[PDB]
Write a protein that holds these residues in place. Structure first.
Motif, PDB file in Angstrom:
ATOM      1  N   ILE A  31      76.945  44.895 -22.699  1.00 40.41           N
ATOM      2  CA  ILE A  31      77.914  44.898 -21.958  1.00 40.41           C
ATOM      3  C   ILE A  31      77.425  44.667 -20.394  1.00 40.41           C
ATOM      4  CG2 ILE A  31      79.841  45.597 -20.596  1.00 40.41           C
ATOM      5  CD1 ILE A  31      80.109  45.302 -23.211  1.00 40.41           C
ATOM      6  N   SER A  32      76.729  43.541 -19.737  1.00 40.99           N
ATOM      7  CA  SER A  32      76.770  42.734 -18.748  1.00 40.99           C
ATOM      8  C   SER A  32      77.343  42.853 -17.547  1.00 40.99           C
ATOM      9  CB  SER A  32      76.306  41.604 -18.542  1.00 40.99           C
ATOM     10  OG  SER A  32      75.317  41.042 -19.687  1.00 40.99           O
ATOM     11  N   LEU A  60      75.837  49.513 -24.089  1.00 44.13           N
ATOM     12  CA  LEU A  60      74.690  48.939 -23.729  1.00 44.13           C
ATOM     13  C   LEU A  60      75.226  48.769 -22.100  1.00 44.13           C
ATOM     14  CD1 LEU A  60      71.536  49.990 -23.365  1.00 44.13           C
ATOM     15  CD2 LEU A  60      71.351  47.753 -23.710  1.00 44.13           C
ATOM     16  N   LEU A  61      74.981  49.284 -21.626  1.00 43.73           N
ATOM     17  CA  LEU A  61      75.303  49.360 -20.073  1.00 43.73           C
ATOM     18  C   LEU A  61      74.479  49.052 -19.183  1.00 43.73           C
ATOM     19  CD1 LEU A  61      78.356  51.936 -19.602  1.00 43.73           C
ATOM     20  CD2 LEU A  61      78.462  49.996 -20.607  1.00 43.73           C
ATOM     21  N   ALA A  62      74.267  47.847 -18.194  1.00 46.73           N
ATOM     22  CA  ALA A  62      73.128  48.412 -16.943  1.00 46.73           C
ATOM     23  C   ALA A  62      72.955  49.616 -16.421  1.00 46.73           C
ATOM     24  CB  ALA A  62      73.612  46.836 -16.210  1.00 46.73           C
ATOM     25  N   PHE A 111      70.370  51.327 -19.571  1.00 47.08           N
ATOM     26  CA  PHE A 111      68.811  50.699 -19.767  1.00 47.08           C
ATOM     27  C   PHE A 111      68.134  52.220 -19.271  1.00 47.08           C
ATOM     28  CE2 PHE A 111      69.719  46.774 -17.535  1.00 47.08           C
ATOM     29  CZ  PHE A 111      68.934  46.727 -16.300  1.00 47.08           C
ATOM     30  N   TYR A 174      65.652  43.410 -13.205  1.00 46.45           N
ATOM     31  CA  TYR A 174      67.015  43.323 -14.155  1.00 46.45           C
ATOM     32  C   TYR A 174      66.218  42.805 -15.272  1.00 46.45           C
ATOM     33  CZ  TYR A 174      71.058  42.765 -16.296  1.00 46.45           C
ATOM     34  OH  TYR A 174      72.287  43.034 -17.241  1.00 46.45           O
ATOM     35  N   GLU A 178      65.931  45.434 -19.170  1.00 42.58           N
ATOM     36  CA  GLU A 178      66.993  45.095 -20.114  1.00 42.58           C
ATOM     37  C   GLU A 178      66.328  44.383 -21.845  1.00 42.58           C
ATOM     38  OE1 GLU A 178      69.887  42.253 -20.180  1.00 42.58           O
ATOM     39  OE2 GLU A 178      68.261  40.770 -19.303  1.00 42.58           O
ATOM     40  N   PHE A 182      66.580  44.317 -26.280  1.00 38.85           N
ATOM     41  CA  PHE A 182      65.973  43.370 -27.277  1.00 38.85           C
ATOM     42  C   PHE A 182      65.387  43.162 -28.298  1.00 38.85           C
ATOM     43  CE2 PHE A 182      69.041  40.316 -24.609  1.00 38.85           C
ATOM     44  CZ  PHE A 182      68.565  40.643 -23.584  1.00 38.85           C
ATOM     45  N   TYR A 198      75.951  39.875 -28.245  1.00 38.73           N
ATOM     46  CA  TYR A 198      76.768  39.424 -26.842  1.00 38.73           C
ATOM     47  C   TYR A 198      76.875  38.178 -27.037  1.00 38.73           C
ATOM     48  CZ  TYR A 198      75.854  38.391 -22.048  1.00 38.73           C
ATOM     49  OH  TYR A 198      75.572  38.307 -20.438  1.00 38.73           O
TER      50      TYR A 198
HETATM   51  C1  LIG Z   1      73.345  45.742 -19.553  1.00 41.34           C
HETATM   52  C2  LIG Z   1      71.832  44.646 -20.691  1.00 41.34           C
HETATM   53  C3  LIG Z   1      73.162  43.786 -20.835  1.00 41.34           C
HETATM   54  C4  LIG Z   1      73.157  43.308 -22.541  1.00 41.34           C
HETATM   55  C5  LIG Z   1      72.835  41.662 -22.659  1.00 41.34           C
HETATM   56  O1  LIG Z   1      72.481  41.377 -23.963  1.00 41.34           O
HETATM   57  C6  LIG Z   1      73.186  40.558 -21.846  1.00 41.34           C
HETATM   58  O2  LIG Z   1      71.743  40.607 -21.164  1.00 41.34           O
END
Ligand SMILES: CCCC[C@H](O)CO
Length: 230
Positions: A31-32, A60-62, A111, A174, A178, A182, A198
């Motif tokens: 979730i971007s 997954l949130l920022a 993250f 950022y 993150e 991935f 995504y």
């Molecule tokens: C919170 C990280 C969001 C990850 C998504 O794939 C965009 O980077």
């Protein structure tokens, strides 16, 4: 509803990602922040579809470095931190609603929630090492930073701001924070295997899958694009 099961068409990054996806073990929903795509109803669709298709679902949130996106766009630090916390609480609320509706565990993290996780820290250190030592990898990382800054500015009505290098290097913190998800999200979290999901292609992931870096995705990690079609 089988409309929900078919809500997304899946495009894997690699044939290995396709096998992980078809195994259905785990989906991590990215979730971007500061991205108009992630409305309440879209987050609901993501979790509704994931709950009907996968054995395990995690959101997954920022994390903290999301403030760097706002800062690079001019926002002063404490206003940026405040707006990150509001953005994350909003994502969490919408995610919790849908997970609770599906009878799913509220498995939601940022993250930044893994600073005492050895897998996260070691992958993060590898990412930082090659960002510093491999100009090719750094260039791809800065392009990811450009993408994140462009998408934030558009969603915050700031396409009038030129994107400079120092903006890119500030925002790339950022990206680096993150990226371990991935590369190794399943192993960080503790699942046998997982796909991060995504709605946009991951061009650096395409290069990684073309064997262009010493940075590798974990063998049990995949990436999928979700598309919606009529
Ligand atoms: C919170 C990280 C969001 C990850 C998504 O794939 C965009 O980077």
């Amino acid at each position: 509803q089988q409309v929900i099961k078919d809500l997304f068409y899946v495009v894997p990054l690699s044939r290995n990602c396709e096998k992980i996806y078809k195994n259905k073990t785990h989906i991590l929903l990215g979730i971007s922040p500061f991205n108009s795509k992630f409305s309440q109803n879209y987050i609901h669709q993501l979790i509704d579809w994931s709950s009907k298709n996968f054995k395990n679902v995690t959101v997954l949130l920022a994390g903290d470095e999301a403030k760097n996106l706002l800062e690079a766009l001019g926002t002063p630090t404490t206003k940026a931190e405040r707006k990150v916390r509001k953005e994350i609480r909003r994502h969490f609320r919408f995610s919790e609603e849908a997970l609770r509706k599906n009878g799913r565990e509220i498995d939601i993290y940022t993250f930044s929630d893994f600073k005492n996780n050895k897998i996260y820290n070691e992958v993060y250190q590898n990412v930082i090492y090659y960002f510093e030592k491999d100009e090719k990898f750094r260039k791809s990382c800065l392009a990811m930073s450009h993408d994140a800054l462009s998408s934030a500015a558009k969603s915050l009505n700031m396409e009038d701001i030129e994107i400079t290098d120092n903006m890119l290097f500030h925002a790339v913190k950022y990206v680096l924070a993150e990226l371990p998800f991935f590369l190794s999200g399943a192993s960080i979290l503790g699942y046998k295997e997982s796909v991060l999901a995504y709605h946009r292609p991951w061009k650096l992931g395409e290069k990684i899958k073309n064997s262009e870096f010493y940075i590798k995705m974990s063998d049990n990690q995949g990436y999928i694009i979700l598309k919606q079609i009529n």
